Amino acid sequence: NGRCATSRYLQVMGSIHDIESYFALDNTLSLNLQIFTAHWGHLAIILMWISGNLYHIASNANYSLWIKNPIPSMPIAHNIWDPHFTSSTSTPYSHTTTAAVLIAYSGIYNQLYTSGFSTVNQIYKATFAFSCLAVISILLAKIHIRTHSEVLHNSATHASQIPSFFQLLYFLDVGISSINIRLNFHTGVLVGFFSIAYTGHLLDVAIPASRAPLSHTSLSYLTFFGGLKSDTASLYLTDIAHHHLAIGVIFVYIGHLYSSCSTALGTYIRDMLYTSAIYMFQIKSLHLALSLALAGCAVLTSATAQHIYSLTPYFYLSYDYVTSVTLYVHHSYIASFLAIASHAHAAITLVRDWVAPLELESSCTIARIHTHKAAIISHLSWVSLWLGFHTLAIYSHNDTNMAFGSPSKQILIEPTNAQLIQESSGKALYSFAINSFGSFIYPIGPGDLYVHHAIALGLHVTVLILLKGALEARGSKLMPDKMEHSFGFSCDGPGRGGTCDISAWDCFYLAMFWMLNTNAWIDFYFHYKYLAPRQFSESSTYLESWFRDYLWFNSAPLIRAYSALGTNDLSVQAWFFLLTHLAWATGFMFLISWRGYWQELIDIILYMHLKTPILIDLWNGGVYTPLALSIVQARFIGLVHFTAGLILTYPPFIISTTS
Amino acid sequence: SHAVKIYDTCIGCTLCVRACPTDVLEMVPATVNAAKQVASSPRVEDCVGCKRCETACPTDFLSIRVYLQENEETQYSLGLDLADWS
Amino acid sequence: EMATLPKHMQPVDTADYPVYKPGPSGVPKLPQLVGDWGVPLPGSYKACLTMVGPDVETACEVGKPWDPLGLSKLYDRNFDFNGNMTYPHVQWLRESELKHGRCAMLAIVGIFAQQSFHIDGYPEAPWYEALKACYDNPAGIVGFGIAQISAFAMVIEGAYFPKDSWIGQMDREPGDLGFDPLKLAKDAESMKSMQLKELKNGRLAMMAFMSCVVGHYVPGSVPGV
Amino acid sequence: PWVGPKKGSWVKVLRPESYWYQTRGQVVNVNQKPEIKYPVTVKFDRVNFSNVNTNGFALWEVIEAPAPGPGEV
Amino acid sequence: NTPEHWTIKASKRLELCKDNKAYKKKFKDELYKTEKQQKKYATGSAVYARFNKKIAQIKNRQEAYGDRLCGKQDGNPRVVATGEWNVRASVMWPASIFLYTAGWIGWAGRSYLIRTNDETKELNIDVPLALTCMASGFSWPVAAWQEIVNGEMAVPSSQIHPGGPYTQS
Amino acid sequence: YKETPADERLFEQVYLQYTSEYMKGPMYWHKDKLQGSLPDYPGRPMIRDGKYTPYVLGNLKSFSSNELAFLSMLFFGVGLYGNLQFNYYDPQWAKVDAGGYFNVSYIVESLLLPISFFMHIACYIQKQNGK
């Protein structure tokens, strides 16, 4: 199609991986095969990422020196080869005659060290092997493409005599879309047997590497101590091995649940769902499966974010002031993204996958939810309003009283429920000890109570927006016929009072801001309590403490990184602090100023180009005629700028303050 | 191009036709309603997607619907002036 | 005059198909195990009016039950609240009332007789800690005895579960477990008089047991305790 | 004869996409012509988003209901 | 480990304010700041008298708050939210009175709306009826429970708009 | 003769009813009618007349209600005994910490409690089905 504008690129890039929207993707067979191949390529990318990390650790870094003195030493991420740096004098990242290096804040050093890596040769062998695994993944993608092509050819060449041969149309993608066998093998082999295999790895490599004296592998390597070994300040490796052994056994047992290879054994998921409380749903729906997987991944990512910090599993990881914060924040952000992703894909499932029954029929869980979506949304709004009103009001009361200089006048509600739960947990742990757990129990005060209620507000409002989008995706009082329109469309016009941000994609756009806010609140809470436990406990009850003792006070090293006096190793962090501020501010433009103004401006610019003497005779403007970004395109671009600035301006701050 | 559809709830008041900026719509004889006429959309290729017909529709929910199709944008639906795709 | 609307032209009202009932398709809902939850109907207050129990103590008579808070009408109200039978029928309320009356009638005399007498082999403790002591020190005969008591209670409860009484569609009369070994009351008049007497004594025992517990756990709340 | 509801009587709207779905309006008039798909005319005291007070419904989209009470829509 | 410890009074993270060194130090510092600010102005000044009043207010506040619990580390009075009524700085009394007042406001309002049932009355308030409803809203707990029980509070969901259509008609 | 809106609606209703019956029938083939999709697996109807069938119990559909009840009660008793003995009345944590092995009886026994629960729901289902 030669007739095109510059919006062509953005329209394509917004759905490059929306395989269901592809032209000439006739059937679910094509859809599933394309998705499988994309998955293989994704695994190849992950393996190449692992191989690159390992290679750079081996070559550009100091793993061998670090493992000798892990406590004061700092791992190297990779060298800096940037021509723009000053050549007259040494940079802050060099030893005045040495290649510039970057410190590593990913904990991969601790990971390798407690896995059992002793020499750079082992890291090199791993780099090589993971590259080979990437090759294997790509070749498997090719193999499966060929096998599925060979089945289509067969079905074309051979036909059942009876007219029911068309029934085979449904079973061509059975290997990719079968649920019982996939569940059995995933939960039994990919999870349980993988855990058992890692137990074997620990017993064979990690335990001997950690233990100075040689001792034959035996049940003595399996223990149920708890807490952190004093020397490494981490969970006993012997306990990790038992842990994984136990989980592996349990999940290997659970992996015989469904009928996978024969119909003589196992039960059916259709049958469980039919007989259970949830009536039934489109288990075949790829969007629904993606939503469930994303929800599970989000909860697991949050769990690891909390537990890696609480119970240190890696040698000397706790000693690394910066790496702990970086890991927690990283996995918290990933978890938030995965949660909002699950919600967005549930909305998409409702839009284009769910087969709604007739209105009066109420047989499925989704229909039952749609019956009282109004009640759900109203109650969620009530909870959000209560939390916001009271949290903000108590914080403002404390703010005003502190500003007037009377801390005694502050409202300080003791967290009695959380303290009782914590005391019960401590009682259980003390009983176990009589038969250390660091950071699993924390002082907990009224400031913690207020911050927890703020985080609850954030979660409730995010879920409010996402649930409203999902439950109004098919229809709404303002736009009853929303099923016909795509998942994301600009608007419905200025009629009916105006219909800005009326689509389910627009609800996601809105919930993205909240996710970022609630995640920022969580990260600020963790970082403040981590940096200054005592000051946080005493002063975190009013917002001026957050604005002064946390942001303004700890912002000094970052902004002072590079100045008229000189530069230090945080100069890069200071430049990325400002670059990300600028990106956020740019996102404000696409978020505030909308398309008509920019289309008219583009028209004027195009007029100028067409009136320019030399340029007109070469460039007509007919092909890829410039245009202003569409409404949805600009919404997304502004959201991307906002998200990039917000997310990327934090790591510089945390590194500066914790380093 | 966009898709302009008309449903039998139409009462033939002609407000959509009068609000059309590029004359996409026209009233046609019918027996479904008392006015004995229903708006049609023969020239949907000229529809720009302004939803002024939708704004002017009286019925409880619109008897005329404009579905936007950004993938099938043409110069007529984009209102191109400085550049020509013809 | 009205022109008879044909069936195809007849509107299908939404109120005729509540959530608790199968829709126009007519497919039965998922089977329920605790009971066969049939289509509930509003009859709680009428059943309460018909039921025995009110006699001049609160200045009331049969057909005029004592219910200042109207907890018996909440079953009828749940039809307007959700369409989900969240609040129990007066049948379930009477079943629970009779169960509590019998349990408390046993419990009060049990408290007094535990204060007075005792059984060898069982731990010595007050009425407010005897069960906890037995649970904590199962040895000799207390473990077997408490196992017997728990098994008997669970078997009786399972055998005489008030099926569908939550909806009021219970086949048997509330509290009519059939336990009449001596056949003391058989006639309808005698049955009604004895039902009223049992309800009165059970209410008195419930109040006495609550007074005992509250007086013990708040020393000055009740004079006797 | 009168095919639809009586003039002036209250009818509950059963059109799911209607702004007044499941709420009641007053039958302004009914078209007796058999060729009218949506003869009944119902007016409501609550204007919809387009500030429209009345609408036309088919005989199967309206059922007879009592007049709204205090605090009822 | 004991039922006695259920009370917030018997907690290891709190102490009586009159016996809290941090609380005493904070108040002593507030008093010192107020006195230092007062010393700037002349002795017989109206501002001097106002500062004397403020110092008296601070001392009375210290005396009143001495009974309340406060954390050992910071020594700021705490608000008990367990549900214990007979405890200083209990949340139940303010909670109960606010709930009564808020229900009063809501009931009054709902009653005006039910009685009027007209946008014209909503815009131009019928002040007599509004005042009557405001006065009548004092029995809102009993009135609301009675209406809930008798079915005059909530209407069946089939009588109100459910929302947008999620399926084909 | 003129086909009025009422006549068109009548045609629509008759078409809907008849063709819906046809689609339910075996003459219409759709991807949603495969095994594992909406329809029950052949020969194993889980729910009939709004009541669980014996097939919901899988391999226990041939067990009588009486023996199912006995098995559920026995499993409940044994599992509860094992759980209480393991947790409170015969703790094993101290012995294991000393170095001894668990009482293998308690671990295998304790699994019977959830098995007992599901065996009761199966006993009720079988009894409710007249078996």
Ligand code: CLA
């Ligand atoms: C062309 C672009 C493209 C690309 C690059 C990918 C990439 C991916 N897709 Mg795919 N996908 C695509 C298009 C694409 N997809 C399209 C168009 C569709 C149709 C909607 C899908 C539908 C789809 C589904 C349905 C799924 C994927 C998944 C994946 C992953 C593949 C395997 C992998 O490496 O996982 C690496 C992942 C891990 C190492 C993490 C494993 C842990 C999982 C994710 C969570 C398990 C939770 C469990 C169910 C519950 C725990 C309970 C507990 C809390 C108690 C990867 C992120 C899978 C995935 O992981 O989704 C999140 C998946 O389930 N995709």
Ligand code: CLA
């Ligand atoms: C920091 C935030 C930010 C930024 C960067 C801009 C930028 C711009 N706005 Mg503004 N704008 C903002 C916020 C911002 N806006 C907000 C929040 C709103 C909403 C109220 C608006 C609303 C708005 C309107 C309505 C208009 C503008 C206009 C403009 C343009 C001014 C002229 C110009 O481009 O000269 C300066 C350009 C820059 C400073 C951009 C950065 C250039 C850097 C320093 C050099 C680049 C180096 C190198 C080549 C980069 C290569 C990178 C690559 C290799 C990866 C410019 C694109 C006007 C316009 O377009 O006029 C023509 C205009 O009409 N803005």
Ligand code: CLA
């Ligand atoms: C979550 C609860 C649950 C429920 C309600 C059911 C229900 C059912 N399963 Mg079972 N099943 C479960 C879990 C469950 N299963 C699990 C976890 C697995 C994996 C091991 C299986 C694997 C499985 C298969 C392969 C088959 C069934 C079948 C059945 C049916 C007959 C059950 C029977 O006869 O049990 C009574 C039998 C026993 C109690 C003996 C079980 C003994 C083995 C070793 C399993 C016990 C493992 C234990 C719980 C975990 C050990 C953990 C470790 C730490 C020691 C019935 C529908 C059969 C059927 O008809 O399917 C259509 C069938 O073919 N199930």
Ligand SMILES: CCCCCCCCCCCCCCCCCC(=O)OC[C@H](CO[C@@H]1O[C@H](CO)[C@H](O)[C@H](O)[C@H]1O)OC(=O)CCCCCCCCCCCCCCCCC
């Ligand atoms: C770096 C760390 C910090 C930052 C983290 C990243 C930022 C946060 C993520 C953004 C938040 C939203 C994420 C959701 C994504 C899907 C949304 C979507 O498709 O809707 C985006 C929508 C999709 O498009 C719409 O689709 C609708 C159908 O649903 C209709 O057809 C609409 O008309 C159509 O506009 O809008 C767009 O088309 C957006 C325009 C996209 C333009 C991008 C072109 C430039 C790309 C350069 C960057 C390279 C890209 C590869 C990245 C490499 C990474 C390895």
Ligand SMILES: CC1=C(C#C/C(C)=C/C=C/C(C)=C/C=C/C=C(C)/C=C/C=C(C)/C=C/[C@@]23O[C@]2(C)C[C@@H](O)CC3(C)C)C(C)(C)C[C@H](O)C1
């Ligand atoms: C709290 C308190 C006080 C009090 C009090 C009050 C008012 C207490 C009241 C107590 C009350 C009212 C106690 C009734 C008991 C009834 C029993 C045990 C009946 C059993 C009956 C049984 C076990 C069986 C009966 C059968 O008929 C059945 C069912 C069927 C027949 O075939 C067979 C037989 C005949 C066997 C003080 C002292 C005033 C002050 C102080 O502060 C403490």
Ligand code: SF4
């Ligand atoms: S063009 Fe923009 S402002 Fe106008 S209705 Fe659409 S989204 Fe709203």
Ligand code: SF4
């Ligand atoms: S959207 Fe605008 S141009 Fe298109 S038919 Fe409607 S009124 Fe005419």
